[PDB]
Design a protein around this ligand. Sequence first.
Ligand code: HEM
Ligand code: HEM
Lengths: 735, 735
Amino acid sequence: TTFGRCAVKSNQAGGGTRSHDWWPCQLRLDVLRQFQPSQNPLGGDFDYAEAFQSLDYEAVKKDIAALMTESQDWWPADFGNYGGLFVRMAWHSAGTYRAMDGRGGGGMGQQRFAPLNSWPDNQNLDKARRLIWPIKQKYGNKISWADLMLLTGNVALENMGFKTLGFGGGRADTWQSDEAVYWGAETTFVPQGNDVRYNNSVDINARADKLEKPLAATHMGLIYVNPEGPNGTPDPAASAKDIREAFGRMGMNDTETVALIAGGHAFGKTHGAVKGSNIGPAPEAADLGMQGLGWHNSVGDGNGPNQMTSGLEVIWTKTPTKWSNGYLESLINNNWTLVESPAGAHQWEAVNGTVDYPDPFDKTKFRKATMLTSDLALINDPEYLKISQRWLEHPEELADAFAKAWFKLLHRDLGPTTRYLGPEVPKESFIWQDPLPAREGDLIDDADVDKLKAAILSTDGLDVSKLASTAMACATTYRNSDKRGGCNGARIALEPQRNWVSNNPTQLSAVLDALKKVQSDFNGSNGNKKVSLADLIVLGGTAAVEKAAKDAGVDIKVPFSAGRVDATQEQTDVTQFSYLEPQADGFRNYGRGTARARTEEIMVDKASQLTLTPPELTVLVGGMRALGANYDGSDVGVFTANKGKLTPDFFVNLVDMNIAWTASGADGESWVGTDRKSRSEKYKGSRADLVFGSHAELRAIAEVYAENGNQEKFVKDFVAAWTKVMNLDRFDLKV
Amino acid sequence: TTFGRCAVKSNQAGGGTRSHDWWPCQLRLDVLRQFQPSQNPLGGDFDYAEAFQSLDYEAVKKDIAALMTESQDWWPADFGNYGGLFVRMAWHSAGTYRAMDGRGGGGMGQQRFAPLNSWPDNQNLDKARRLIWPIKQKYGNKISWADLMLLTGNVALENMGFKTLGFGGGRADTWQSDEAVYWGAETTFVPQGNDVRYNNSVDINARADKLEKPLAATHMGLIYVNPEGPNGTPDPAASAKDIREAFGRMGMNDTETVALIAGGHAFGKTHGAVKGSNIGPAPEAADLGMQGLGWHNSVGDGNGPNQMTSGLEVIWTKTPTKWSNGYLESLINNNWTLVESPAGAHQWEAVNGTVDYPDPFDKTKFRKATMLTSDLALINDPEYLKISQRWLEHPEELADAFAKAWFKLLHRDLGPTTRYLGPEVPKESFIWQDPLPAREGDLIDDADVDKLKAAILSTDGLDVSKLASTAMACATTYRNSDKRGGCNGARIALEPQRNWVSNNPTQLSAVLDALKKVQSDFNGSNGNKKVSLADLIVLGGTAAVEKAAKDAGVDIKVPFSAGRVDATQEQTDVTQFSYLEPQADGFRNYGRGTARARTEEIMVDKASQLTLTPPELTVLVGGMRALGANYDGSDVGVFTANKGKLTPDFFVNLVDMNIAWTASGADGESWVGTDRKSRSEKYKGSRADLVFGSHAELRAIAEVYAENGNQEKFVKDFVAAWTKVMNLDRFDLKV
Ligand code: HEM
Ligand code: HEM
């Protein structure tokens, strides 16, 4: 029966018809209520960085390597070596990343939760995770599951003869499914799962470059592309176009793409020994006896020669437990014919080739060379073919590219270098790490901070509104999924941010010139002290908030943490930063949504990426309005006669029943507030403004700040949230 | 159009297919992640009791009374008085309560959130809540919405000539929709919304007492019953049967039921002036312009003479703003004919009666007497008729019953009287308050506690397992939804708890005799220090936990909070306490699930009622197993060779891959753990045990406790959780 409904209707533990069932279009605050400290079994104060740095890292790697060849009878090792399986585990963990929204990736260890634990493409990776569990058990909280799944892959490569660039730990574990990711709207998995992302187009060559943004896989439940070919059609040329699209959506270019696929498929094999009808439910659907595993295979013991994962039965090289150039040799030198695997799937077998590909359980049995459609892709696109042919001839260039791309794969969502832990962090800085320079000079102190705040506030062209607006515009580029963005680097002053329409470029230029004047007056006049433009942008907003609170009758300390540095344009890639450009910004009343993402939904999504709770989101919006900090200085949402004073007037006026709110535009984005007694139009509001008086949970918070006498609490809460947001990217600061 | 699916599929803020869509039968931990401190805009520190006790209570009441007759143009008051509307608001807030499971009621102020804010039976209570908001805005955090909604009703009665018994404040606000309540499984509201709860029966008399347990309303979206009769059939006798059933499920008897209905319907009127097609979406479905209101009526201004709420147009009495006996006088003395309201609903009108029922907006217009089918029910049932006839002749008896029943309605989920705040708490002790006496003698001090711990741990018939088991058995009766149960009162020693099968009465009796011996030896030999059995039960389990920790190699001070009292059997009504009897208790490995709720779902439900987080639930279960604290003393789940020592052995052995787990019972409730090397059956487990190694988020926590070196953390976490559970009902310590 029906999608998303259990046949048995529970009457316990949340069972029954729910609010989101009745009103499924209503804004949900779920994404702001994930990952809370109380839900974390290690405690909200657990410091993973401190724990990992005490880890006996060399012993961990030695233990992983030993485990690679300790075959467990419940899931025997192919060729006596789990290396391939472990590499696949790590690649699948990291491989969900989408560059555009920065979600997916290995950094939260989400493979161990729903839905990723049960995606078809992750079949039998439950066995891989269970095999490495003893390492986690031994070393405890000093290595996270997130770090372990990836380190295991890295160690596996090295112990199969491929030296990597190194590794960085530092991924703190998470403790619930991340239900904030848009993986797609399809209600089916691969082999279906993609009508929506191709908008019902089935012309596989024509549609390949039309995959729905921000998605990076060609079906729901896949990592990147379909190994049988697009929609299971065994056409390598069309497969290549899907690969370029999907890898492009994960942030990889042609060279990196070939290197990753040719590199990975040096190792191990696929599994398609028996038909899929022999395979039981995925882990989330499996019975208690499976104890977190799934896909139980009822043929023989369900494992060893009977392994069934993808349905394909391909062994790429003659030495699947050792690095080689066998993949490209076979790919290019064989002639290929289309055959079926034992499970009935499309794959390719060498015509008149050698019968010397080894069987994983019988030293006396051999097979012909085989390839996936998605491997043949690499010789059925002009650019992939050029690259493949070059690396056939010069396998050392493949090894170099693969080491670099593999490091990128594993660390693309780890954030800045200051987050990377351990004794073998690669020394080279790569553009995808959004590199920052080491700091200039002696750090400014409290007395320097006080002098600079006063200098900033007395500078021509700087006022409270512009300072707060500018600081927030910088800060809200942060996203916690891939730990990119934020104020460190002062990238608002660089391309593309300085030209973002949402930053009001002409205004921003004047503000930045003013702050650069403050900088020039200070630097070289305070001994060895120097201040960055990044610190000044943040300090400016912070001084503005402090002054705005004082102007509202509240003397409060507004914390400031110095030490940001300024990035160079060379350290600031235009494409990578283009992904951080907002289409709507509720903190500064910029832009609007579209049919599939309303303005207020975009705001809540951004709030989740800033780790804000509903009260934090609410207080920040209300304070930005009081400060008059809209991107263009408009009065939209500015429901106060004391703009620039930090009061809860936004909320008080929003909930005043003498104001009637009506739509002005056709699109529902603009609203007018009319005084019911006088009949005069008093206010203009956006959806980002009015949602706080509509949504019942947000309105409950709006009410708190609208209560008589809450001027002081509002200020304290605002300053706390402001501080949190300004410091999100401060990984350089510990404890 | 599909139920529970939005026509437009958002791609932000949680948009996209979710884990619960793919695997809707999987256990969800959502109910353990509600009401988190981080989500409370008042802060986790906030002490509502302190705030309320500083409230100018008499001033709030004076302002409410004044509001009643200050008609607002946007929602004009009937007869110039909002009293009736406010009484309905309070009644509906309190009126969702179910005695069996203790959910619903006014104690969380949930009417202001989904789904209650948008149930059809709460139509236009959005206006009522908006009308009282200025009181909340004036007094701020010193009165909660939860308290204010009910106090407003109470004040309304008193200002319309009906003196109540008084009032108790103390309901702290909540900050999200409580999605833990089972309101039913239907996918429609009233006029439908009841196929499931009557298992498709439309035999209205025969089905009336077969309403699905634990439901207490005859359709989804109703408070109790359908005012037009069962499934809109205007049959008063069949309506009576629904009313007895629904009110009985809300914990009200016949006298109480007639008192509440005839009491309530002394006041105000219903609204059915225009057809339902003129009425817009409910609040959760309304556009932003409605700013949290809904049911916009497009006829005229939508209000005053055009008010449309239920579709009925009944004015029960000739003085709807003043207490009278006119309801019963009309009901009994008139001859009733079935007619249609202007909106097309069935109601009753008096045939050749007086034409003196006043119009709510025109002092010069009068109408005939009218009644609902649900009112005529009260003279179309033999027991109700006798009560109605008596109170027609003896109106003082109705007044007395109504005062008492109204007090019970409003306070039934407030908990022990130690929670009740304000200057007019009624002095009478009522059985539904689960009353407790004053203490005997002087409070034991730490010297006494040390002596008592030593005695308890060297007394015939007591040991670690039994002591821990007994304390938890007493503790888990607590439920946060109506603040009932817990260890205070030692009600495990009284009927009905002492003979609950889940308490293993023969073992319990031996444990209690032994504790009573300890009590006898202490009492009357330590001057005037006296210790209660309640304290000894908790102290015994606490001492046992502490010793078990010590035996495991961890020295920890397990805190104990003295001062519980022992309830009397007179204050412990067998029926009142039958409602707390558990179907299953995973903490002590008792019981089995039902067709509609698996054992593990019942456990998570109970955990929610104990306010436990997932880590707290997990640690408690593993510790109870290590302690050998099963209700029957069995080894099911006792995955340890060191029973009685507080180790994480439960987790270490649960996750040992050398153990294979298989179903033993046809009912799905029993499991066997076989050593795969030896082939020996090693363990036996229940669903409550094995879920911790199956569910991905619970198993993630199980793994923490199974990690090498976490023996101390396990004990520390257990002791914190133990302390939390033991003290849940200690409202006397907050007082
Ligand atoms: C277009 C991209 C890719 C596709 C469609 C693809 C497809 C597949 C499939 C279908 C399997 C077999 C799963 C099974 O039946 O057991 C597999 C195995 C594997 N892939 Fe990929 N792959 C891709 C890219 C990569 C990348 C980037 C890496 C690593 C850098 C990688 C490394 C592996 C390894 C090591 C295995 C072997 C697992 C084992 O021995 O158990 N692949 N791949
Ligand atoms: C069988 C139980 C009950 C049923 C079916 C019922 C039904 C109704 C309905 C249909 C309305 C009209 C809503 C509208 O159109 O505005 C109403 C109004 C009202 N009921 Fe009840 N009722 C019940 C019990 C109670 C109880 C227990 C109380 C209070 C103790 C109460 C007090 C009120 C009041 C004060 C109003 C008037 C609201 C106003 O003047 O705006 N009722 N009832």
